[PDB]
Amino acid sequence: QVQLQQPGAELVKPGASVKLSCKASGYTFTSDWIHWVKQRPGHGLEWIGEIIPSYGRANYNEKIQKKATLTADKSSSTAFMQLSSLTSEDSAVYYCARERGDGYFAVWGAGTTVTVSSAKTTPPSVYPLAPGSAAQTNSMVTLGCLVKGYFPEPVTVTWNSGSLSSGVHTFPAVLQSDLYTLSSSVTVPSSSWPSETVTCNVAHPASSTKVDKKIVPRD
Amino acid sequence: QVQLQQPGAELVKPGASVKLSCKASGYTFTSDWIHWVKQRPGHGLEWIGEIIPSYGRANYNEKIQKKATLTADKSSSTAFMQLSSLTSEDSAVYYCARERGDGYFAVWGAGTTVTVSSAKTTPPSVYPLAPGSAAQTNSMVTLGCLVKGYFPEPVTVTWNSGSLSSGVHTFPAVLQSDLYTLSSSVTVPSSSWPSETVTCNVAHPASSTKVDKKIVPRD
Amino acid sequence: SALHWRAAGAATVLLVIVLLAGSYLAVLAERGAPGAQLITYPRALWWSVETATTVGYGDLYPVTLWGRLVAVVVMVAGITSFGLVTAALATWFVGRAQERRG
Amino acid sequence: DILLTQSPAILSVSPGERVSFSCRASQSIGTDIHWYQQRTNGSPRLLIKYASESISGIPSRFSGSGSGTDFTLSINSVESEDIANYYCQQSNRWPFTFGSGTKLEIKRADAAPTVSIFPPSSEQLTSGGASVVCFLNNFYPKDINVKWKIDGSERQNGVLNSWTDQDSKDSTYSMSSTLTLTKDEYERHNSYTCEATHKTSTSPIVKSFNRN
Secondary structure, three states: OOOEOOEEEEEEEEOEEEEEEEEOOOOOOOOEEEEEEEEOOOOOOOOEEEEEOOOEEEOOOOOOOOOOEEEOOOOOOOEEEOOOOHHHHHHHEEEEEEEEEOEEEEEEOOOOOEEEEHHHHOOEEEEEOOEEEEEEEEOOEEEEEEEEEEEOOOEEEEEHHEOOOOOOOOOOEEOOOOOOEEEEEEEEEEEOOOOOOOOOEEEEEEOOEEEEEEEEOOO | OEEOOOOOOEEEOOOOOOOEEEOOOOOOOOOOOOEEEEEEOOOOOOOEEEEEEOOOOEEEEOOOOOEEEEEEEOOEEEEEEOOOOOOHHHHHEEEEEEEEEOOOOOEEEOEEEEOOOOOOOOOOOOEEEOOOOOOOOOOOOEEEEEEEEEEEOOOEEEEHHHOOOOOOOEEEEEOOEEEEEEEEEEEEEOOOOOOOOOEEEEEEEOOOEEEEEEEOOOO | OOHHHHHHHHHHEEEEEEEHHHHHHHHHHHHOOOOOOOOOOHHHHHHHHHOOOOOOOOOOOOOOHHHHHHHHHHHHHHHHHHHHHHHHHHHHHHHHHHHHHO | OOOOOOOOOEEEOOOOOOEEEEEEOOOOOOOEEEEEEEEEOOEEEEEEEEEOOOOOOOOOOOOEEEEEEEEEEEEEEHHHOOOOOEEEOOOOOOOEEEEEOEEEOOOOOOOOOOOEEOOOOOHHHHHOOEEEEEEEEEEEEOOOEEEEEOOOOEEOOEEEEEEEEOOOOOOOOOEEEEEEEEHHHHHHOOOEEEEEEEOOOOOOOEEEEEEO
């Protein structure tokens, strides 16, 4: 089971602060250290700091402007990272990771996507992508779903609640007028559809929404 | 006497494995380590791994794909190297060497030529090379023997069971249509031949054959 | 049993506790200090032993104030423990020699 | 603090070939180096610890070597799933530091794109909007151009494209091209066409559909 639980995303207005959480399960020792790593889009992994929950002492990267403050709640096995007075430079995915005091990160959290923007949150609209009536099918058929008008990133798209993985491509979002848009592609044998149902599941952490959109052939 | 005995050669089909041996004689201590070194044609010496027979522990070069597994039989004073799933990259001479736990290889085995090929084994045909009837001799005469149609390498050519060494050249084999060919040259005083017999001895490890060919003047 | 043996046993157990506590506390003290090497528990335990025995190879050592204070406690506990075993051994030989006489 | 250098930043290799990633430390760190793999949109994954120690769950293909200042992460016979970013990390001195990362690229056989065009949904039109989506899937090399034509006339306004990174499933690339228009603009045009021009063919692959 997932050892480290982190929220999917956090939208923060410039100048404001946010407190990220990392909930641990699995074996826990008084000697465990919880680390936080920052990763901006298209860039590498940057070490931020660490904390030992059993004692509460925290250390921080001295080489970068100190934006973080680490704390830990022993009773809920949750580690926290307070980031304050943020700017666009602070937008990135923040991972938490567990180190058994032996130097390496055995396991990582899924990461929390933090977005620093003045824009307001907006859930995505999911539209179907079924072939036109004149498209000729081979032994395989390609279907899809359009996910537009959402903010901030990210959104998670799965097909048939995750049971359908092969032949799936989900394209990177494009930003236009403070809103993101992307489409996801799925290919199944032409014979299996529509007899066997095909549905995409779109989850948007920032708006706490998750919707399904069944793909059926055009009239 | 030869301290380390290794078979001359081993032919292995691609994907198969082979177990090389290194039999030690001479002083033997519980503190001796037997090392294995690989050398591809025209290249340097590459350390593969080591084993301490008295305990049986083995260490291996971590920097290269691990093809070897070392074992040792205390009763027969023989060290073994199991090479598995070989490709043409594994064809080379493999030496075993003894180290007295003081860092250097005091003595080396003769090496085992390992050939990875789909071709079948074939013993060499040895033909004489005597001067034509019109060749004019000076104070020295050059004779020889042709060794062709063998596979795999190597073959060892000596003259008069090794007693004749000066004035001898054995040329590198040439590969054509999955078979090797080479000739060996010998020069003796023109006066001494044919009164004193001259014979070449050709040994081919892979076929377990060793033949002699007396060189006599043409009719 | 006799006092010197009990004290020796007690000193040994105590020493082991100081090595364990010291290893843990050294890492806590040293992380946060640029360049510190005494920062993972397994080698810190090794470090604590070579410190308690007074070998001090120099492969590992504390650079911070608290790591050094922890080190001093480890040193003194180690010296005291082994000194106490020596003292127990002396007591044993002395008692026996009296016997050999009467 | 220890600087970890990973060069080259990108490595292109052919399938089944052995590959080696380099990581150099600014000073000697014994074997206190660890390797992580991070696939697109995924979290980092421990591959090797202390330079050469195996992690359960990781394919035998992965191995590490080195000590001192020079380290290597190797993969015997690369396959599509190995496409990702690779990072080294040291735990010799405080603070722990990460290498700058190396991207793995696989050079497969050329592949023509599978093109699919999609008409706006009834659900979207109901909101006064119309998006025509075209997929250019599983092609290689990644260089490709898409052109939109409405009623035979090339259209450029309202078009946004998106390219995936090399796919860890089959080492190919894919691209989406979305032409967004108002319900009105969409109602005053008949045919919409998507054309893909790729190295694999002198002639473009075109897909169209009529609004009727």
